[PDB]
Amino acid sequence: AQNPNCNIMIFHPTKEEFNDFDKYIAYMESQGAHRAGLAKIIPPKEWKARETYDNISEILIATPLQQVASGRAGVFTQYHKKKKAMTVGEYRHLANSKKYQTPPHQNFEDLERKYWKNRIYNSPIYGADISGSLFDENTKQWNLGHLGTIQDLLEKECGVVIEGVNTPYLYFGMWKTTFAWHTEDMDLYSINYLHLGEPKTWYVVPPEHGQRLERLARELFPGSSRGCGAFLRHKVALISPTVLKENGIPFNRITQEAGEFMVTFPYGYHAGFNHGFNCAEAINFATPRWIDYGKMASQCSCGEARVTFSMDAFVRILQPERYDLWKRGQD
Ligand SMILES: O=C(O)CNC(=O)C(=O)O
Ligand SMILES: [Mg+2]
Ligand code: NI
Numbered sequence: 001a002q003n004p005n006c007n008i009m010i011f012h013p014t015k016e017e018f019n020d021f022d023k024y025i026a027y028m029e030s031q032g033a034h035r036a037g038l039a040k041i042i043p044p045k046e047w048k049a050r051e052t053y054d055n056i057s058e059i060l061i062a063t064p065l066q067q068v069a070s071g072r073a074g075v076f077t078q079y080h081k082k083k084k085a086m087t088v089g090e091y092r093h094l095a096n097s098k099k100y101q102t103p104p105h106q107n108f109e110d111l112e113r114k115y116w117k118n119r120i121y122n123s124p125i126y127g128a129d130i131s132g133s134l135f136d137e138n139t140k141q142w143n144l145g146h147l148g149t150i151q152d153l154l155e156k157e158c159g160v161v162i163e164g165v166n167t168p169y170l171y172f173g174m175w176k177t178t179f180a181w182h183t184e185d186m187d188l189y190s191i192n193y194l195h196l197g198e199p200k201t202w203y204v205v206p207p208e209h210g211q212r213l214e215r216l217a218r219e220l221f222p223g224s225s226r227g228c229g230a231f232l233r234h235k236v237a238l239i240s241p242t243v244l245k246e247n248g249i250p251f252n253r254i255t256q257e258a259g260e261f262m263v264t265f266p267y268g269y270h271a272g273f274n275h276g277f278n279c280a281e282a283i284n285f286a287t288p289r290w291i292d293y294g295k296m297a298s299q300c301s302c303g304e305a306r307v308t309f310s311m312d313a314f315v316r317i318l319q320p321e322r323y324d325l326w327k328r329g330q331d
């Protein structure tokens with residue numbers, strides 16, 4: 001069995017290997033990369049996403065979100081308070097202000113210590129889930145807006161044509177902006193490209209151990225667990241590496257820098273934080289190996305998780321028994 005300790009693997013494709021996306025995902029899986037839940041892909045030196053980032057300041061962040069925490073330093077939830085619209089140039093200046101800028105630090109480990117110690121005492125502002133792309137239209141390799149669609153994958157594998165579309169999202173981050181513990185919708189893959197700026201630290205639980213994380217989360221968030229049998233779908237709960245280690249939960253960590261891709265694999269729980277002002281692009285995707293995970297994915301039906309238009313068809317076709325209840329949750 002490849003990668004039996006479920007370590008995060010890092011790949012360096014050549015320019016020739018970077019031509020065929022599906023084939024390279026399948027190659028990484030042949031080496032056991034999916035066992036970790038997360039992999040890093042460093043593009044060949046010949047590749048670029050676009051020519052420059054000098055002209056992005058006029059992008060609008062219509063609904064910046066202030067991430068307000070409750071709990072204790074290692075075990076907390078966050079809620080998202082809506083703020084007034086601002087441009088990417090206004091947001092960059094905000095991120096660099098004395099109130100929000102990254103503190104002085106020695107290295108990534110020191111900054112990680114400071115994050116876990118102090119995150120709860122601040123409320124950073126995040127631009128999230130902004131439909132759009134920063135890939136140049138002429139970038140032919142690993143262009144996140146030109147991937148094959150999940151609806152076409154399901155049709156190719158299962159024969160059923162369905163409605164829906166699949167497009168990328170942009171994220172603008174600052175120091176302490178936080179992504180809560182989650183898997184993707186319908187336990188899909190995701191791919192994330194860090195376009196510019198400061199790093200993102202990731203934490204991940206191997207897919208084969210995901211139920212261990214869920215059992216801990218029920219113990220640590222007991223009211224939330226009573227409210228909903230899949231409350232991690234709400235994307236609000238944080239648990240620190242120290243707390244995971246105290247409770248014997250298997251996980252790994254890695255820092256992504258600008259110019260690097262990360263792939264998350266089906267049912268790989270992940271969480272993390274941004275180091276300072278940055279811009280990332282991400283999209284979900286599927287492969288043949290996903291279909292079995294999609295058929296088994298939990299679902300939130302309490303009303304909280306509320307998701308995209310395109311999830312309807314995935315639930316309807318892969319999970320017909322659950323469809324009626326899930327749809328009540330959506331309405
Ligand atoms: O850019 C981001 O904040 C977070 N991304 C993810 O959880 C992902 O790509 O799967
Ligand atoms: Mg602009
Ligand atoms: Ni994710």
Ligand SMILES: [Zn+2]
Pocket residue numbers: 227228229230231233234300301302303304305
């Ligand atoms: Zn729910």
